[PDB]
Amino acid sequence: MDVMNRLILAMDLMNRDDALRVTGEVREYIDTVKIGYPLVLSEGMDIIAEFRKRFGCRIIADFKVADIPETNEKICRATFKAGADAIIVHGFPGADSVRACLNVAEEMGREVFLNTEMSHPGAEMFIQGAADEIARMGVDLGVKNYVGPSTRPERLSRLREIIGQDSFLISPGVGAQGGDPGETLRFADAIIVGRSIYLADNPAAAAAGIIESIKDLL
Amino acid sequence: VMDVMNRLILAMDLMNRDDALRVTGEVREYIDTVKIGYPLVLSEGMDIIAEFRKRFGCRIIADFKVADIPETNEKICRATFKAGADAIIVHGFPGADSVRACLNVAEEMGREVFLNTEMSHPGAEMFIQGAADEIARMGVDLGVKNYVGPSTRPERLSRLREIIGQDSFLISPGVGAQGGDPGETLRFADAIIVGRSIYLADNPAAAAAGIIESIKDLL
Ligand SMILES: O=c1cc(O)n([C@@H]2O[C@H](COP(=O)(O)O)[C@@H](O)[C@H]2O)c(=O)[nH]1
Ligand SMILES: O=c1cc(O)n([C@@H]2O[C@H](COP(=O)(O)O)[C@@H](O)[C@H]2O)c(=O)[nH]1
Numbered sequence: 001m002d003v004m005n006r007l008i009l010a011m012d013l014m015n016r017d018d019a020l021r022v023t024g025e026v027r028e029y030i031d032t033v034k035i036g037y038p039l040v041l042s043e044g045m046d047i048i049a050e051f052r053k054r055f056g057c058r059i060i061a062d063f064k065v066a067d068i069p070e071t072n073e074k075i076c077r078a079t080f081k082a083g084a085d086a087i088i089v090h091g092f093p094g095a096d097s098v099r100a101c102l103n104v105a106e107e108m109g110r111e112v113f114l115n116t117e118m119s120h121p122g123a124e125m126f127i128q129g130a131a132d133e134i135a136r137m138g139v140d141l142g143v144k145n146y147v148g149p150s151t152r153p154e155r156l157s158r159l160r161e162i163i164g165q166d167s168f169l170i171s172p173g174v175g176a177q178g179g180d181p182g183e184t185l186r187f188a189d190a191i192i193v194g195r196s197i198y199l200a201d202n203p204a205a206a207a208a209g210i211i212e213s214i215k216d217l218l
Numbered sequence: 219v220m221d222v223m224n225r226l227i228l229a230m231d232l233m234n235r236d237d238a239l240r241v242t243g244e245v246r247e248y249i250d251t252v253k254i255g256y257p258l259v260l261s262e263g264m265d266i267i268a269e270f271r272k273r274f275g276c277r278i279i280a281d282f283k284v285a286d287i288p289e290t291n292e293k294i295c296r297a298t299f300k301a302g303a304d305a306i307i308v309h310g311f312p313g314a315d316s317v318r319a320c321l322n323v324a325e326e327m328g329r330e331v332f333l334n335t336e337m338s339h340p341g342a343e344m345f346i347q348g349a350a351d352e353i354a355r356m357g358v359d360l361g362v363k364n365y366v367g368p369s370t371r372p373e374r375l376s377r378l379r380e381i382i383g384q385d386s387f388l389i390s391p392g393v394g395a396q397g398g399d400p401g402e403t404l405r406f407a408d409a410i411i412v413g414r415s416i417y418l419a420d421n422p423a424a425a426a427a428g429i430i431e432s433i434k435d436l437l
Contacts (some may be wrong), residue, residue, distance in 0.1 A: 014293060037282070038293035041301070044263050063256070066283045066309055068339040068396075074233060074257035082260070090285055092311045094341020096421075120287040122313020126349045126354075129231070 001058070001086075001111070001145070003190040004031040005211050005218060008060070008170060009037055009193030010142055020054065022203050024109040029207040031199055034192055035119065036062040043165075045082040058085045058173060064115065065089035068099035076104035086111040090126065091134035098141055111145050114138045119149035119173030133162050135162040144168060144211055150179025150191065160187040174210075185217050219362070219387040220277060220304070220330075222409040223250040224430050224437060227389060228280070229413030230254055233261040239273060241422045246274050248426040253411055255281040264301040277304045284308035284333065288319035291394075295323040295331075303331035307366060308407045310353035311346065317360055330364055335378050338368035338392030350374065354381040357424040363387060369398025394408065395428075400429050404436050 010031050011211070013019040019039055033051060040047060040061075046057050061084035065072050072089070079087050091103045091114050098114065105112045117131035131148075138146060139215055141164065148159040148171035160169055171188035173179040175196025184191050193210060200206035212218070219433050232238040238258055250391035252274070257307045258266055259280075268277050280303035291308070298306050308320045310333050317333065326330045335357070336342055336350035357365060358381065367378040369392035379388055393399040394415025403410050412429060419425035431436075 012290065012293065014297065025397035034348045036286075036290060038297065039289060041259075041264055041294060041297040045260055064283075065283045066285045067255075068337065069256065070259060071231065071339070074231065075260060077231065078257060078260035092309075093337060094339070094344035094346070096339060096341035098341075118287065119314070120315060122288070122317075124402035126311045126345075126353070127313070130345045130349075137344075155310060 004011070005029055006185055006190045007207070007211065008032045008034050008192045009197060010062075010172065011191050011198065012038045013040050013198055016043045016047060018048070019043070020050070020164050022198050023051065023055060023108065024112040025204045026197060026207045028074070029204075029211060030057065032058045032060065032062045032190070034062045045078070048083045049145055052083055059083065060086045060088065060113065062088045063080050066093050067097065069096045072097050072100040073104055075099050077108075080104065080108040082108050084110065086113055086145070088113040088115055088195060090115050091137060095137055097142060098137070098143070102141065102143070111169065112143060113145040113147050113202065114143045117145040117152070117155055119177055123197055128155070132158065132162060135159055135185065139163060148188070150174045150184040151177050153183050155186065157186065158189045182214050182217060184187050219408065220390045222371045223245065223434065224248055225404060225409045226426065227251045227253050227409050227411045228416060228429060229391065229411050229414050231257045231283075233257050235262045235266065238262070238266070238427050239269070241417045242270065242274060242276070245416060245426045248276060248423070248430060249408070251277045253281045264297070267302045279301065279305045279307065281307045282416070284320055285312050286316065288315045288367065291316050291319040292323050295320050296327070299323070299327045299329045303329065305332055305364065307332040308336055309320055309334050310356060311349060314350065314360060317357070317362070321360060321362065329392065331362060332363045332364040332366055332389070334366045336368050336374050338370040338396055338398070342368065347374070350415055351377065351381060354378050358382055362416055364389075365386070366390070369393045369397050369406070369407070371404040372406070373403055375403065375406045401436065404433055
């Protein structure tokens with residue numbers, strides 16, 4: 001996956017007009033948008049096709065898929081029907097649940113991203129202790145796309161070690177949650193940025209600023 | 219706690235609006251509580267919750283397995299309750315802050331949170347099972363009153379009932395298609411969740427009635 005400027009916009013605004021306007025304001029800087037449940041549950045799955053029509057951007061559906069295999073298959077099918085290029089799935093529910101998603105992605109010509117360790121403080125309770133094993137599970141299953149935490153560069157580096165340089169790694173927690181863009185790109189292929197851009201007085205200048213700060217990494 | 223008719227919750231995971239409505243309507247006399255998940259919501263929109271409320275006298279539990287950071291969890295819960303869901307189901311494996319985010323929105327909005335503790339499918343054995351007792355205890359500590367646990371592992375369902383106590387409300391999926399027994403599950407759960415055994419049956423109403431006949435002495 002070739003992400004413009006190594007920068008993925010997390011579009012978590014919850015109304016269509018604002019989401020479209022802000023995305024339009026930063027369109028020159030990105031070509032990949034992560035759309036999650038905040039926007040989809042507020043405006044419907046048709047918003048994905050709308051983004052594709054307006055911007056041609058790739059769409060990663062951040063749905064943290066975390067059900068039994070049978071339900072996971074249905075969720076992926078509905079998601080790809082809506083035009084998503086990729087879906088993000090949790091590894092904590094185990095290998096069968098991940099495989100269910102890989103099957104549908106293969107059928108519809110899409111990608112699965114595996115979330116290995118999350119960025120927020122609560123990730124320390126249960127997820128962090130399982131994270132290396134979840135990463136190895138991804139490797140065993142043939143997963144090629146991963147998500148790991150900008151807020152813990154040492155853990156992000158370990159995840160990169162496990163999955164290898166061939167795998168694709170994206171990383172949220174940059175900006176609002178405290179992660180640094182350049183440090184994160186030592187290990188991740190691309191950074192995910194939400195509030196630092198979409199809540200900024202001037203989203204375009206915020207994106208431009210982040211890009212300026214990592215210009216030597218592009 | 220919610221008064222679940224016949225201790226039976228329909229898992230409405232058909233992805234077609236016409237079929238979902240038909241089947242739900244056919245079993246309406248047996249079931250006043252419907253679990254709606256992402257298979258149906260992602261296919262037909264959040265307005266499906268509105269349509270079920272309009273058409274049927276049913277409570278709606280939004281099974282969204284909420285599993286994000288606290289800030290995003292808050293947004294998901296707000297949108298879900300705004301749409302008319304009585305309750306939402308959240309994961310505990312992302313930790314206490316993520317659960318608390320959901321509880322806070324539910325408190326503010328006058329709705330309820332269910333916490334998923336151990337899941338019913340084989341893969342749950344890899345990571346979830348080992349965390350499940352602690353996730354349940356965490357729930358108790360956070361003041362969670364409603365829980366989900368697995369019909370497919372009676373021993374685990376029993377332990378989870380112990381941890382959360384008799385006053386807590388416990389619902390349990392994995393009955394029928396996944397191999398769990400209605401009667402045995404109701405030894406520990408307040409209500410059973412049933413999907414395919416009902417919605418894929420030639421006569422969903424007869425399937426529901428048959429489940430209910432099998433547990434008649436437990437009502
Ligand atoms: O570990 C993770 C995984 C995520 O997907 N995310 C998501 O990435 C985005 C981060 O947005 P923000 O830059 O506003 O903190 C949100 O959509 C959040 O749900 C995260 O923050 N941490
Ligand atoms: O541990 C769990 C938790 C669930 O919510 N579920 C959900 O309960 C329902 C089970 O449906 P069924 O009776 O068709 O197996 C599905 O909606 C599934 O997503 C589950 O099967 N196991």
